[PDB]
Design a protein around this ligand. Structure first.
Ligand SMILES: *[C@@H]1O[C@H](CO)[C@@H](O[C@@H]2O[C@H](CO)[C@@H](O[C@@H]3O[C@H](CO)[C@@H](O)[C@H](O)[C@@H]3O)[C@H](O)[C@H]2NC(C)=O)[C@H](O)[C@H]1NC(C)=O
Ligand SMILES: *[C@@H]1O[C@H](CO)[C@@H](O[C@@H]2O[C@H](CO)[C@@H](O[C@@H]3O[C@H](CO)[C@@H](O)[C@H](O)[C@@H]3O)[C@H](O)[C@H]2NC(C)=O)[C@H](O)[C@H]1NC(C)=O
Ligand SMILES: *[C@@H]1O[C@H](CO)[C@@H](O[C@@H]2O[C@H](CO)[C@@H](O[C@@H]3O[C@H](CO)[C@@H](O)[C@H](O)[C@@H]3O)[C@H](O)[C@H]2NC(C)=O)[C@H](O)[C@H]1NC(C)=O
Ligand SMILES: *[C@@H]1O[C@H](CO)[C@@H](O)[C@H](O)[C@H]1NC(C)=O
Ligand SMILES: *[C@@H]1O[C@H](CO)[C@@H](O)[C@H](O)[C@H]1NC(C)=O
Ligand SMILES: *[C@@H]1O[C@H](CO)[C@@H](O)[C@H](O)[C@H]1NC(C)=O
Lengths: 445, 445, 445
């Protein structure tokens, strides 16, 4: 295991502990986003602006419909006696594709039944007359229809239509139309270029609906405060499954993935702090998080994942290999841990763990309050430990802290420690270092 | 060239292929953004809030007008006999500048005739009375005037002004004024510090106009769906060219670049996959994209560029040098390619290219469906090729795929392959590795 | 010092100079954000939607109130004779925490008097009836109350309530409620998970108030155009200090930090340019900025700081150590500077400094205008210097520039220069380089 005793002596302290979770088997819901609203009540005046808008919508949606049909043409159902019944990808026709694209092509074909079901409700979809509405399909799944422009009209024009001239109606609706179209190009643009591979988060989808993703979740059937783990990590995503160029709408399938708890896997945080070396201040280099899975160590690359209050959530397993030298450190060999000189005025100089306080008392104030006496650590010792045995309250920096009883054998000593090699890391001077060391090899004879 | 036979044996597969495009000679259009609206119809009530707002505008715009004049003072036209007729930078007065800043200072002076043309229309600019409007200059270029607050007032106050008390008018317009000013500080803030160097995308400009960049493009005369290559890569950019502190407006010149297709240059994607090594799973390290230009290889740094469906588009040529060892890989010497151990549960285990499937059948399921038979690859072989000759349909993983005819001499074998060295990369343990290897040199005698 | 003479010979030119500033002792202001508005005038129709909303607010705020109480339970005031009077952290109860979290826990307890003062005004806070309002506390500090939903209602519903049916009122307010709730989850989500450690910028707070941060600054008492140094660098931040689950409001304390000018510390920019080497084009690798503090060199990592027109502003001192080899360069030893081959078509080929122009005239046009004659630099020389002595105006590239008098002894020569080692840097091929060099060590015997 981590053997935290040997780590504490070089300013690495046992931090928080988190569960590891991964995207599991997903549930799905159907949604339709309308590009062309139902113009009822303002049809008399907006005719000139609306006819321009319909052409813009048709021109934008035609390439998408072509790309979708071109993908469906490459997938055929397993009607033959083939025992692994499913769908077959025509690899000779698709030409070049990653496993992701091939899987997405199959998933698009698998999603086509929902597209047909939605298409049979086109007459109802064109008649919603409300900012957002829920409909029932022949498959008895519910369909959420988004109608943002109808919301803008129902709230800003229809209530005051008596005070607005017909010219004003034309101009105002024209502006609202162009505004909405710019929203769609901002949010859906990538998917409109490549609809098979691209996915969109529910937040980004909701940017086309005044960022009101909560209303979308509510109408699909989920409470936005309950889904926090899935919602905030960006795992609630959707993709295009069909498009209609005459009705002007995009059919999206939204995915609500469950989260599988990874068995016997734990993410451990490490808290680095400064330590004394012959009066100088040094810090040990180790990643902020390390993943222990069935006793095996690994590096998480946590920036691509979400650190919740109690778990780390990832789109897929992101564990990376770790160099033998670093594993030495994480297994108690203090002599292999790279260390770096402190230059910044401010660097963390103490930490609390299981009620014990570890501190670099040669570079920060440390005083026993029960005896109003300063605590001195010999210049050989790296870090001091504050214990319940000597004092109940200690001053550290400008704060007072109360601490617990030491759990090891005898008493803690930090002088007989095998320090590691000094290192400096930046892209710029790594090059200089590499070149300089290679000159020795170039000169070897 | 890439010699993809030798690459496939270590799990690098021929991906998609793209044109390389660069920002060319630009067209330009003129725009004015007004900070101060025309207050007609609400002039009676808003006076106290409006007089504060004019002071805030003047205080913001004065330093910009100073910085602009201080730059124009350093550029003088070539009225003397100088044979390379143009404009002269007073380098002793400018003091310290990059080539970019010197060029932008010259371009500001070159733009100043448009500033004079706009300034002679100031009387009309102060009268526009519509949310966005087009004017004709004396030079018979058109000017787009943006007037966002007049849009807010025309839509939300004037239609209901009978129902609002005069105090309510004052408060509501004071809020709209402060809101708009906070938009301007968000979007233009950098350019208001440094107007010569700074550039702003048309999207970011449109954040001052309810994100409606489509309406801006329409009025400048271009259709937002037609410009996608230039628009979405963020190459439609503007900069400040003049400011008026009493009328309270910013004059912008917006740049619509052409794209030049780079001659005899191609960007090639490389798809990595896992492969077997004696029962372990390994991946080869190569960049996702490489650029071949007149048979020269180079590294693109593609994150700074846009990958469209059919081209890679860049603000400038970004080709970087490449290490001899990696060129070795990309010219078929398998022995120099660094390789990394797979630790994640998920890494891509097959890919499709020109209708062939390459797969790592010791680490994923592979079966011939025409004979309902599992496919075995001998433990020396890195990857298996799936061919038309044996089967028309293969299962790979949980998908079925139909595949094309092999094109080489004889039949593919992937056992006699010269593997490269094992590597682990992160900044931290690059540090540890560098120090540890250098101890051999430090000890040599 | 930097010894710019030796640097210019390898295409490194003296750039701009900036002050170094750090976050100092902060002032503070109090703010309350209301989740539940006062429903006056629309209470008849919205009852069904409002009762749902109150439950959502309570469910969201209860965990926050629990986490806050759980933190306050660990801090006790120094009522005993302890001489360093203040507050004591119960480290045995807190368990594991970084110095930052411990300090924030103490700061939360120190902030609790303001929480009590605000809580005694709860009856007034629930009655604001205006989009934003200022109140006076018993401590005579002013409290800013944000009431966004009341603003939306006062501007879009109450002025036209005669034209809206009761059903329409219910639906429209329901949409506004869900929209606002989604804004709150977007902006405050992180703080609602971990309220002790998390901080929010005034801009992000204002996202819950139609991005109108200017109005917030105005009501708290500061002018948004005057605070630019603190405001734009993102240093105006607030954190949660109390929450009420019945009134449904979040109490925030906002921090306005002063900026301390760091004594005898200067940030110096370095402008790299190409230079000739035996007809090839090369660039020297050095960081864009370097920090000289009391004659000591250091690396700034400027991406984490704000580069204003005249100063660099940072949240804390971020100076990092620098390798001896790079310090050699920055101290005049030209032989240690890593250099890289130019491949991109465009790289900066000239620069202006103190009125002198440095240019790579073997790779760019250079002509004297007083004599209409090209300037030739011998293939041994790296960079040419343009001086007042020979010409008053020089053409460089496609621009004309006037230059000053050389200040050194004799005349400038760039041939007898000790060039450094060639280097190539990327994460991918650093691995290949490291592996290849280590094979020599593996083979040494
Ligand atoms: C292997 O790693 C060590 C790390 O300790 C490298 O040490 C470097 O050695 C040089 C020369 O001994 C140091 O140069 C400095 O020179 C000045 C002027 O003489 C002197 O005052 C300094 O005290 C120091 O000796 C350099 O600072 C040092 N660098 C580091 C980061 O420690 C060593 O170069 C590497 N081995 C080889 C063969 O390069
Ligand atoms: C330490 O650095 C030097 C450069 O200063 C490295 O030299 C490199 O050596 C290789 C192998 O000779 C060169 O690659 C190619 O070699 C073939 C056969 O000699 C030649 O025909 C090609 O034209 C090409 O030169 C390479 O160019 C050269 N330079 C660089 C920058 O890589 C040397 O490899 C390093 N030390 C060790 C032990 O590797
Ligand atoms: C140059 O590169 C080689 C790899 O090609 C480095 O080899 C690595 O060296 C360490 C120390 O000998 C090995 O660790 C030990 O491995 C054995 C067998 O797995 C294990 O029983 C020990 O407990 C310990 O972990 C490491 O495995 C080995 N790497 C490989 C892939 O075999 C070598 O260290 C480098 N040379 C220098 C001078 O740094
Ligand atoms: C539009 O025309 C219809 C015709 O049936 C009429 O009922 C309606 O009042 C008209 N509306 C406006 C705003 O002119
Ligand atoms: C403002 O004054 C004009 C007369 O100058 C009047 O016609 C208009 O109705 C007034 N508006 C208000 C809101 O008092
Ligand atoms: C709501 O009820 C009050 C009476 O308490 C009445 O004065 C008010 O006009 C009503 N509003 C609506 C919209 O029905």
């Amino acid at each position: 295991s981590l053997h935290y005793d040997s780590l504490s002596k070089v300013g690495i302290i046992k931090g928080l502990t988190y569960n590891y979770k991964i995207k599991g088997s997903p549930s799905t819901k159907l949604m339709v986003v309308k590009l062309i609203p139902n113009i009822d009540g303002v049809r008399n005046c907006t005719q000139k602006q609306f006819d321009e808008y319909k052409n813009l919508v048709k021109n934008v949606l035609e390439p998408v419909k072509l790309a979708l049909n071109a993908m469906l043409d490459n997938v055929k159902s397993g009607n033959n006696k083939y025992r692994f019944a499913g769908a077959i990808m025509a690899g000779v026709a698709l030409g070049v594709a990653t496993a992701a694209t091939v899987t997405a092509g199959i998933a698009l074909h698998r999603s086509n039944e929902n597209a047909q079901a939605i298409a049979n409700m086109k007459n109802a979809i064109q008649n919603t007359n409300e900012a957002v509405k829920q409909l029932q399909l022949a498959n008895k799944q519910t369909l959420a229809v988004i109608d943002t422009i109808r919301g803008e009209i129902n709230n800003n024009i229809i209530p005051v239509i008596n005070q607005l001239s017909c010219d004003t109606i034309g101009l105002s609706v024209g502006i609202k139309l162009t505004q909405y179209y710019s929203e769609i190009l901002t949010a859906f643009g990538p998917a409109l270029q490549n609809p098979v591979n691209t996915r969109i988060t529910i937040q980004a989808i909701s940017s086309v609906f005044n960022r009101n993703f909560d209303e979308l979740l509510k109408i699909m059937g989920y409470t936005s405060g309950d889904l926090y783990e899935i919602l905030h990590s960006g795992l609630i995503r959707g993709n295009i499954i069909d498009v209609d160029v005459e009705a002007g709408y995009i059919a999206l399938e939204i995915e609500f993935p469950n989260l599988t708890l990874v068995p016997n896997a734990v993410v451990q945080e490490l808290m680095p702090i400064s330590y004394n070396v012959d009066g100088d201040e040094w810090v040990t280099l180790v990643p902020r998080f390390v993943l222990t899975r069935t006793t095996l160590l690994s590096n998480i690359d946590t920036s691509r994942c979400t650190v919740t209050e109690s778990s780390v959530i990832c789109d897929n397993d992101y564990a990376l290999p770790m160099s033998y030298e670093l594993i030495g450190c994480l297994q108690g060999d203090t002599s292999k841990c790279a260390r770096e000189k402190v230059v910044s005025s401010y660097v963390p100089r103490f930490a609390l763990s299981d009620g014990l306080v570890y501190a670099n008392c040669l570079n920060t104030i440390c005083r026993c309050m029960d005896t109003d006496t300063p605590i001195s650590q010999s210049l050989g010792t790296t870090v001091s430990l504050l214990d319940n045995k000597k004092c109940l309250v200690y001053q550290v920096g400008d704060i007072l802290i109360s601490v617990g009883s030491y759990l090891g054998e005898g008493e803690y000593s930090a002088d007989n420690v095998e320090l590691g090699p000094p290192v400096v890391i930046d892209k710029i001077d790594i090059g200089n270092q590499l070149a300089g060391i290679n000159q020795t090899l170039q000169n070897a004879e």
